[PDB]
Structure formats: C-alpha cells, structure tokens
Amino acid sequence: VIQEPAMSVSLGGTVTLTCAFTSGSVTSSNYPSWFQQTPGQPPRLMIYKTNNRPTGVPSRFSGAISGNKAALTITGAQANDEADYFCNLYKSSPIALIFGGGTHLTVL
Amino acid sequence: VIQEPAMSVSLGGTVTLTCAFTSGSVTSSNYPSWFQQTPGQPPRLMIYKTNNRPTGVPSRFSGAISGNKAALTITGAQANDEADYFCNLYKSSPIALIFGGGTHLTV
Amino acid sequence: VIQEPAMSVSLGGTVTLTCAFTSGSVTSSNYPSWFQQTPGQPPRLMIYKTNNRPTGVPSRFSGAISGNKAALTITGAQANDEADYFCNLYKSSPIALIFGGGTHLTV
Amino acid sequence: KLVESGGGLVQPGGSLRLSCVGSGFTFSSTYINWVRQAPGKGLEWLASISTSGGSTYYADSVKGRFTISRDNSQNTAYLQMNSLRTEDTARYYSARGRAALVATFFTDPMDLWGPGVEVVVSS
Amino acid sequence: EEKLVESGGGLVQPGGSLRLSCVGSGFTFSSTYINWVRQAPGKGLEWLASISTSGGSTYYADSVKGRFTISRDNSQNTAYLQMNSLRTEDTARYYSARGRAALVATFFTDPMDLWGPGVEVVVSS
Amino acid sequence: EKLVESGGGLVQPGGSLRLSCVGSGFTFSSTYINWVRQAPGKGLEWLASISTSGGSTYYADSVKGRFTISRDNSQNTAYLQMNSLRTEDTARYYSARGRAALVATFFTDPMDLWGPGVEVVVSS
Amino acid sequence: LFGAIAGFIEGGWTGMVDGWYGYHHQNEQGSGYAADQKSTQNAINGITNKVNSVIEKMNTQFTAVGKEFNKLERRMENLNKKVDDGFIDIWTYNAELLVLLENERTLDFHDSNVKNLYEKVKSQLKNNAKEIGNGCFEFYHKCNDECMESVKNGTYDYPKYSEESKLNR
Amino acid sequence: LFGAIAGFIEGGWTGMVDGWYGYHHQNEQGSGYAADQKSTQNAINGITNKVNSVIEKMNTQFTAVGKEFNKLERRMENLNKKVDDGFIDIWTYNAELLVLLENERTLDFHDSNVKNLYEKVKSQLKNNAKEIGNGCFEFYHKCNDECMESVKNGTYDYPKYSEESKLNR
Amino acid sequence: LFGAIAGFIEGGWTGMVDGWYGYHHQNEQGSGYAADQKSTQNAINGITNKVNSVIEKMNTQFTAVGKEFNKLERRMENLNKKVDDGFIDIWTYNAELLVLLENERTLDFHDSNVKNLYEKVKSQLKNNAKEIGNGCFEFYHKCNDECMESVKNGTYDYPKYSEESKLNR
Amino acid sequence: ECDAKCQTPQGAINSSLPFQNVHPVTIGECPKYVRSAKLRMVTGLRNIPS
Amino acid sequence: DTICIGYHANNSTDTVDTVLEKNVTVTHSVNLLEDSHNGKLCLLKGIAPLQLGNCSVAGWILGNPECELLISRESWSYIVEKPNPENGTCYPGHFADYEELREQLSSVS
Asked: Where found (chain K) (predicted)?
C-alpha cells in the first residue's frame, strides 16, 4: 500500500490525498479507512467505508474511489488539519489489514 | 358501447339483453354491471361482474358472457320488470367506466 | 417373502438371519421389521426400520440390508435367543404387509 | 344513504358546485362516482375519486372543465362545474362503490345512488 | 401398564360368522393403527387387516378380502374384526397389534410394538 | 468510553512481554480488539486482532508465530503476549476497538476508539 | 422474501386499477392492463380472513375498571393500579408486535402471489417465449387477443405454436 | 406460499402410506410409490419440536382461583372478577392467534419441503429428463430400478446417461 | 425454507470475514473472497429494526411489586400472589414463544437473501455461464476482474460476451 | 383413590395439555382456562385426495 | 421412464382453522384443549382432601353433634363441601370472619 510521502495545501484550499495498492486496484471491497495523527497523540478515525463520517468529524472531510486508488478530499483546509494521514486497506487473500505509509499535509 | 334500443317479451317468458363494444370483444375483464332504472327513480344495481347479485335482487335475474357480448337474462318476466336497463363496461385504455345506450323492456 | 427354514448357532457366537423377496430386491423402503416368538407367547418386536431397537432389546441385536436382502445379526448368542424369527416387509404395489416364512434358531 | 344538493339554473359559461353527503356508512372507505342523465337520453359517467382523494378520474367529455374533490371530515364529496354548456343540462347523481374491507378499487360496483340534482344551463 | 385384550373367539361351523374384540388400556386408543395377525397351529404369522386411527382407511390381505371387515370404536376403546364365511383354513390363533405412533404422525407402516395374548378360533363340524 | 494499555518497558532481546488493554465505558464482549504499533519515526503497523468470544485470531506476517492474542471478557481486558522480541519491535503499542453494530461484529469493523499507548523498548 | 415485488419487478403499475396482481400485454390489436381475477380474489379472501381473525377474536365481558378506595386502604389502591397497569402493558406489547409481524407476513404473502403468477406463466410458455427480465416475456410467434386470453386463463396451446416458435427461434 | 401442494401438483396420493413426501416411478420392471425418509423424518422432527414447544413451555404453579367475600366486601369481589376475566381474555386471545399462525406456518413448511424435493431432483437430472409439468420428469434414457434408487438417494450419475439422452433428446 | 443455506450451498465460508453474504471468484488474475455490501447492509438494517422493535416496545411505568399483609388478611395475600403469578406466567410464555418463532423467521430471512442473490446472478448470466451446483457458475468466456466486478455490481454486459460464449459452449 | 394434578368441581383433569375449557375455578397445577371451543394444531399436510 | 414427486393424502376428516382460510381438512393434527374430566374427586400433591358431607366448615370446626362421624385427619390438600349444607351452626348466630377461617383452614400441613 503506497501513499504519497508529503503534500501541501494553502489555507481555504482543496487537497486530495491518495491511497493505492502496489500491484492491484482499490475498490469498495477493500473498505478504505483514513486516520489523522498528530505526534504523538493516538490516531483519530476520519473516514471509513469511503464515505462515512463519524460524529464529531468536520463535514469538509470526504472520501471516494478515484479509479484504482482511494482518495481523501479536504475542502477548505484549516490550520488544525496539518497532521499525518494514514489509509487502512483490507486485503482478503491473506486476510490482513494494511496501513499506508502516511502523508504529511502542510497547510500554507 | 352498443345496446339494442328496445325489446319486448310476454309474461313468464325469458329475455336476453346484450351489450357489445363498437370494435372489440366484451370479456370478464370489462366487469359488466347491469342497472335497472324507472324514468324518475335512481338506477338500481342488478348484476355486477356478470355473475353477482346484491342482496334483495330477485334470483330470476342472471348474467353471463356469450359471444363477445355481456348478456342479462330474465326468467319469468314479471309486470314490475318493465324499465330501462343499462350496461356499464370498463376499459383500461383511457381508463373509463362507459354506460350503454339503454334498452327498454316491455312485458 | 422367503426365509431360511432353520438355522443353528454355537453359544456365544455370531450369526445372521436372511429375509428376501421371491422376485425382487429388498430396500429400506420395505421397512424390514424383525420379531421374536417364544413358542406360545405373543411375538416380540426386535428390530424396526431395519436398524432401530426398541427399549429393552439387547444391544447384541442389529439389522442392516445386505445388497438385496434383509439381515438380522445376533452377536454373542445366549440361550434366551433360541426362538422363531419373523421378518415383516411392506409392499406398495398391492399395499399390504407380508410376514416371512419363519426361521428357527438353535443355540 | 346519499343526498346531493347544490344545483339549479346557471347561465351558460357559468360555474356550479355540487355536493353529496353520505350518512349511515363510512364515507372514507368507498369510491365516489358522479353520473348525469339528460332528460331524454341515457346515463353518462363523469368522474370518480378515491377513498383518500389522491386518485381522480374523468371522462373525455368533461375532462378539463370538471373537478371532483373530497372532504372526509364533513362526509361530503364535491363536483365543481366550470364553463357550463347547454349540453350539460341533466340530472346529476352520486354513486358509491361497493368496497371490500381490505381493498378499494376503481372498478367497485355502484350499489348506492342518490335522489339526484337537476341542473339547468339556460338564459 | 399398556396392554391389549382379545375376546370373542370360539368354536364355529364352516360358513358361520364370528366377531373378535380388541380392548386396549394404558394408552390412547384413538391415536394408533390397529392390526390383526393370525397364526395357524404350526405355521407362520399372517397379516390380516389394519384400520386407521379414525377408521377412515381400511386395509385387507388378498386371502381375506371380501369376507373380513375390521371396525373401530374409539369411545369404548375397542376394535373389532368381523369374519364371515369362515372356512377350515381359518382355524388359527388371532392376535391384535398396535403400531408405534409418533405424536405428530400416524402411518400404515408404523411398527407393531404392542401385541395381545391372542384368542383361539376353531372352525369344525 | 476509554481504553488504557499497560505492560511494556525495557526488555532484553529475545525476552517476553505481556501487554494489557482494559476498556471502560462500553461492553467489552461486543467488539473486536486490535493491536497497532508505531515505530519512533515510522508509520503504523497492524499486528493482531481477536473476536468477541476469542474464537477467531488474526496476525500479520511480521509477528506470526511470535505474538499471541487473548481476551478476558469478565475482567474487561485484552492481552498481547510477545515472544522472541527483537530490537525491531521497539515501538509505541496502541489498542483499537472496532465500531461494531448491535446485530453483527466483523473483522473489518472500523477502529474508532484508540488508546494512549505503551512504549516498548528492546535493548541490552 | 421471494424477490418479486422489489426484485425483478422494480415498480408497480398505476394504470392497472382493477386488482392487486395482473397482466400487461402488447400485440398488433392493441395494448392494455388487466388483473388476474383468481389470484386477486384469493388474496382478498385470505386478507379479509386474517383481519377478521384479528378483530373478532377479542370477546370481552361487561366490566367496570374504576374502583374507589379511602385513605386507610392504599394496599388496595396499589393492587388495583398494579393489575390495571399490567393488563395495559401486556395488551400494548402484544398488539404492537402482532401488528408488526402480521404486516411482514402480509407483504410476504403478496410477494409470493406475484412470484407464483410469474412462475405459472413461465411454465405455460416453455420456449415459445423469451424472458426479457422485468417480469416480461417476448413471444416467438404472433400472439393475438385469443392467445393472450388463453395465457391469462391457463389454457395456452404449446403444440399449436411450437413449429412457428422453432422457426423464429 | 411456494406453489407446490396446490400449485403445479394438484393433489396428493392415497397409495403412498409410508410418509409425507415421496416419489412415484414407472419403468419396465414396474411402478410404485415410495417416501423420502430424509425429508419426512426432518419434517416430523420439526413438527414434534414445535408441538412440544407449544405444550411444555406452559409451566403452572399450584394455585386456587376461587375466593369468598361477604356482602360487605363488594369492591373486593369486583377486583377478583376483573383479575380472573383479564387473565382468561389474554389467554384466549393468545391461544387462538397462536394456533392460527402456526397453522399457517406448518402448511408453508410442507410446501417448502415438497418444492425443495422437486428442485433437488430437478438439479440432478438436467437435460437427461424433460418436465411433463405436474411434478414428473420423463427420462430420455432407459431407467432401471437401480437408477431410480440412485435418483431418490441423491447419487444420480449424469455422465453415464448423458450420451444416450443426447441421442434421444 | 428456501433451500440455500443448507441446500445447494452446503457450508459457509470462514474466509469471508466482512459480510454475511458474498462472492468467491477465481480467474487468471487471482482468487479471493468479497461480500455483497448492499445485501449485507439491508439484512443488518432489517435485523437491527427487529431487535429494536422487540426491545424498545416494552415501556414499563414506576411500580412496586411487594405488598405486606397480616395473618388476618389471607384472601388479599392470595389475590396478590395470583396476580403476580399470572403476570409472570403470561410474560414467560410470551417471551419464550416470541424468541422461538422469530429465530425461525431470522433464519428464513437469511436463507431468502442468499437464494435471491443466487437467482440475481443466474439471471444476469443467462447462458454465458454453466451451473455446477454448490452455488458456483463456470464461465464459457474469459472473465477478468472488471467483468467480475460488473457481475457483483449488477451491470454485466451479456451482449459483449455472447459470441465467445457461444463459440465455447 | 386417584392422584391427579388439577381439580375442578365437576371432576379432575389428567393431562399435560396447556389449555382447558372445563371450569374457570380450579385447584392445583392446572391448564389455563380459555373460552375457545376448539384449539387444534396442524401436524400433517392439507388433505386433497384425488 | 417417468418419476413424479408428490405428497401424502388419506381419508382423515380432521379440520383446522388457519389464519388465511377456515375449515381446512388436514391429514394429521393434535389437540391442545382439554374438554373432559374423570368425574371423580382425586387427591392433590400426595394428600387426600377433607370431606365434610352434610357439614359446613363452621359446623365441623364448632363440633356439631350431628356432624361428628367425620374421621380425624392429620392433613388435607383441599376441602370438599356441598351446595347449601344443612348441618352448620345448630344454634343461630353470626360467625365472625367466616371466610377468613374457611381460607386459612383450606390447606393444613
């Protein structure tokens, strides 16, 4: 599972993070879940099942499948959105849950 | 809907009224209903769905479908059976309930 | 229904009894039932549905179907097992229950 | 029983509103039908309304001019007549549909009829 | 204490009639099939007739079809076997057996688990 | 709702260690329990999971054969038995509950409730 | 439950106003909606029987619920209140759950009726008709109003049109 | 509900007196009736469990229903009558509705069992037997008693009779 | 009741750890287990509604069951005992029978869901796939991951693969 | 000299059935009283003899 | 050549009521309702009742001279009386809390 190492967005802008497999396609059957972590606080669940927002999550966090790759979109990024974002993918052939590398978002 | 303008029978005889479309066949899906009306009283339901009689209707009134036509049969015509009879037939095309032209029975 | 006229067993040995049709094959659809009759007492049910033991029947009695025939097996025969044995077979073509000829066991 | 009211003399091109009131039966469990009979002609079905008033049907002759409504609280069904013509002079009846306890349909037989209301369109 | 008792047998002439009664106690009589089996003096068993729980269904063997009639009286907890046109070959001991009936189903093929002591019928001059 | 992790500390290479995870504020016998570790400077790594009754246990290939996951529903605690520890196991170990519906619990339940974590150091 | 009401037949027919279940046909002589009288009548009879069983099975005797007790008799008032509240709770729970389960069973009954009617029409037209999904059959032969009526009634003549269907298939 | 007992199978068999469900075969060696022991036994076990669930779940403690009150205790007698009448009404309604609903469910269960037996036999013999409609299949190959017993048991050998059926299909 | 859970699909899949119902596919690109999210979510919603209906339908007011009577008041002690015992008996019987019946209903619901899924996939693949039993379908044409996802979603393009399937049939 | 489980004024009931229509007033572990005239469950099939 | 699948029919006339149709004839059925009694006065819980023939509870517990033939009993499970007993309180009076005493005396260990 490959994520972009780091990307940056401006205040009030829109950024789209990406999660993808090394040798396959990301579908809704992989149940992508996104997590936000500020070192060294515990990870916080952001988006699960590609479109579900837990209570307390700001409405600006949205997800979708953008092809063979999972995508998390932040519309109107604020200063508190500067953190590390991880993607959990579910693989069924070995029955495992795989975390992504992690992407550092820099709000400018 | 076409009905025979007028017919007559003798006392105690048997009559059959018919009700047919301009172009087509009358089946049980048309739900034929027969009404008896005196000129000055509201119509009275006699046979509905070609077989059923409301409670109180004399058993001498019968209904059936014969030869692409709705038939109403009266066995033993009494003196109070002299009135106008109307057939109501249903059409799904332009959903409508259509009344016949009316027949006048003379006993 | 044909059964062996008479058979003999050594004390403590194992024997099998045979029930068969004259011109057919015996399947579980015939519902073989096995009876033991002391010479003077009413018959006693031993095996029904070709494998089932009523309560009180010793575990040494067993039944099965051997190809085209009904088989009753007694393992470790005792002196109380010397009796006549009958098989009941159900036939559907004349809708009747037919008993066997009867086999006498000597221990 | 059913009792109709609200007729009379109306100038051609005028407006009329008929009303039928039902007593002795539940008015919300049956269809309501309107028919008319010219002085020398036969019966002519005009309109029908569902039990809740959602479904409404008309004949091609009066489609676009007649509107049939319901008021179940007041146990009354209405027939509003617009752009009346001389050909609309007839006796207007109200007929309820014999409905089953579990199902009501447009093809329910018309077993109960009102005395009728005479409507005259003339100058 | 489930048991069946047979009665009504004896010495009759050829061409005569005889009626047997099977009374059952200790179990519900109106819930089991009732069968009749006879055994000749020195021969094997022979199934004769069977009657349903309500008496609606009746079955007979080929040898006694038309001469033997089996009835049932659930109120009096008794079952009957009327034999007519008796012959010398009918000299045998007559048993009554009931079928092991499940709570929910009764069938003609229910095993004959409960038997009666039996009664003796002799046909002779 | 709270998950608190215990155990951990300095362990010689090749030793053993048992990590506890006590949950409060929710019914512990109605959710999956997951173990995730984060190395000092690296990303998260899923390690193991356990069913509500403990019948089903899943492990990653990195720690298969060395780690054993257990559960004590009466005491509201879940355990992670660490064996044959190497210096590459030095990480902060979190415990994550799966958002389970009332009528069904699945292995793919989202990890909504986490814990502060415990730091495990494997060194001589 | 049977995959017909919301299964391979997604929507109902607003123009079929003469029954619950029915047919829609399209041939050269025309198209229209009709209802199956047998299935609709059986469904009506069954639902009427169910409603009457729910309603008329409640036979109640003449009774008065109110009861008055003085200040020195509260164990009396509390016992009466307990009895009344328990009866109310039992009846409320039973009525609500009965209504829910009976609604489910009625919907399943209608689904089964539609599925059985479709299966009957399928069994009549063995291979003279092609299934398009949506519950609809395309004939391999010309099907006039008499043939449609025979299909509706249950008197379809397979051997009569077998050769023409084979030619067109 | 499944269209088997009164659907494509119009009536039952009086000559099949050994079970609830079964088969009727006809070949050169003869014809006769038989019962599916597996399905019949499963149905018997289920119905016995249902009947015992209805019966044995009612556990009653020792009690006396009759009470005596003097003529100056009338509210007392009215409260006792209210209690007794309420319990009787609840039990009557529950018993009647319960019996009606289980009477529906048992017949539905039998329908399902017969339809599942038909579907199992349908799956085995694929294009090796045509459907004559009312519950029978017509073999395209010679079917002896061993083959029939294989069909009933569940061990039908389609490859063995595939070619012979193909030549006759 | 529908003959799928223990019928033509003998056993469950311990490898599908993410849904009640789903698919097992095998092609050149690989094999794996996936679950039908729509059917599983619908079943979860239905069962959640059922459980909440059974639980939250019980609304109980504030009351105290205990009552104290002296030795000169035994008719009231016994009347209170009768009330309490009758309520306990009614509630016990109703709860036991309710759970017993809705267990059957839930199992039949799952069976129907699996059967409907199987029927849907059969309808999509008219004759481009061969049934092998066991709930499985063998393809007469090469099938890649995109086509498997089309079958799972419900957008299988039958005309696209008809020629190849006919050639290989 | 008989041992029953339920007692009515006009007799005693010896059965394990859950419901009874003999008498509202009873003594002992007794089947519940109902006003129904019959309560018969189906165990077999619908009888359609040809 | 042919194999059909069917079900069982018999000459049973048993009839059941079903929620969708009434008066359905079925092959086999069971009864959940008892409508018969043995007509005897049996004994409950291992103890026979106390018979008060030509007596009332008041007369028996007061010691009516004409109601003394009753045999002394250690215990009973219930009391058997008769409608309108004749030998009760020979001397006229009012029995205070009579129903209380009747109930407390109904079962004695």
From this structure: Host apical cell membrane
Interface contact flag, C92 H30, Cβ < 8 Å: no
Q: Report chain E residues whose CB lies below 8 A from the CB of H18.
A: 107-109
Cβ contacts of I37 on chain A, cutoff 8 Å: 28-29
Of G34, G37, G149, the CB nearest to B92: G34
Residue whose C-alpha is closest to residue A91's, from H154, J20, I31, K43: I31
Q: What CA–CA distances, in Å, run from F88 to B27, F105, I67, I86, K7?
A: 86, 33, 69, 68, 70
Q: What are phi and psi of B86, to 5 degrees?
A: -125, 140
For residues G5 and G107, the answer to whether their CB atoms sit within 8 Å is yes
K11 at the J interface (CB within 8 A)?
yes
What is the distance between the alpha carbons of residues D106 and G19, in angstroms, rounded to a whole number?
9
Residue F4's CB is within 10 A of a number of other CB atoms, namely 15
Q: How far is I9 from chain A (nearest CA, A)?
A: 21
Q: List the resolution, Å.
A: 2.7
Contact A42, A58 (CB under 8 A): no
Which position has the token pair 């497999």? A21
Render B37-103 in DSSP notation, one character per residue: E-BTB--EEEEETTTB--TTS-TTEEEEE-SSSEEEEEES--GGG-SEEEEEEEETTTTEEEE---E
Nearest chain D alpha carbon to B98: D45
Q: Name the DSSP letter for residue H84.
A: H
Pairing of strands A33-37, A44-47: antiparallel
In 10 A of CB H53, how many CB atoms? 14
Cα angle for residues A37, A41, A46 (degrees, 5° grid): 35
Three-state DSSP string of G43-59? HHHHHHHHHHHHHHCCC
DSSP sequence for E78-125 = EEEEEEES--GGG-EEEEEEEE---SS---TT--EEEE---EEEEE--
Asked how this structure was determined, the answer is cryo-EM
User: Closest Cα partner for F95 from F74, F73, F69?
Assistant: F69
Contact H1 G109 (CB under 8 A): yes
Tell me the CB-side half-sphere exposure of residue C16, using CA atoms within 13 A.
Answer: 9
* Reduced 3-state DSSP string for D4-34: EECCEEECCCCEEEEEEEECCCCHHHCCEEE
Which of C43, C49, C90 lies nearest to residue E45, judging by beta carbons? C43
Contact (Cβ atoms closer than 8 angstroms) between residue D88 and residue D122: no
What amino acid is encoded at A4 in this protein?
Answer: E
For I50, the closest chain F residue by CA position comes to: F103
Task: Name the nearest CA neighbour of F111 among G1, G119, K83, A44.
Answer: A44
In terms of Cα–Cα distance, which of C21, C40, C24 is closest to C88?
Answer: C21
Nearest to I116 by CA among I32, I33, I43: I43
Distant-in-sequence, close-in-space partners of B33: CB < 8 Å, separation ≥ 6: B45, B47, B48, B49, B87, B88, D109, D110
Neighbours of chain C (3+ CB pairs under 8 A): E, H
User: Left, alpha or beta for I140 (phi > 0: left; psi -120 to 50: alpha)?
Assistant: alpha
Yes or no: say if H130 and H137 are a contact pair by the CB < 8 Å rule.
yes
Per DSSP, G4 falls in state: I
To the nearest whole Å, the CA of G88 is away from the closest chain I CA by: 10
How far is C47 from C77, CA to CA, in rounded Å? Answer: 16
Containing F11, the helix (H) or strand (E) segment is strand F9-11
Judged by 3 or more CB pairs under 8 A, whether B touches A is no
Q: Please name the residue of chain D whose CA is at the shortest distance from the CA of residue G106.
A: D102
d(CA H149, CA I121): 33
Which chain C residue's Cα is nearest to H24?
C92
d(CA D111, CA B57): 12
**Counting runs of H as helices and runs of E as strands, what totals does chain H give?**
4, 4
Across-strand partners of G133? G136
Query: Where do we find the tokens 């003998």?
Result: I10
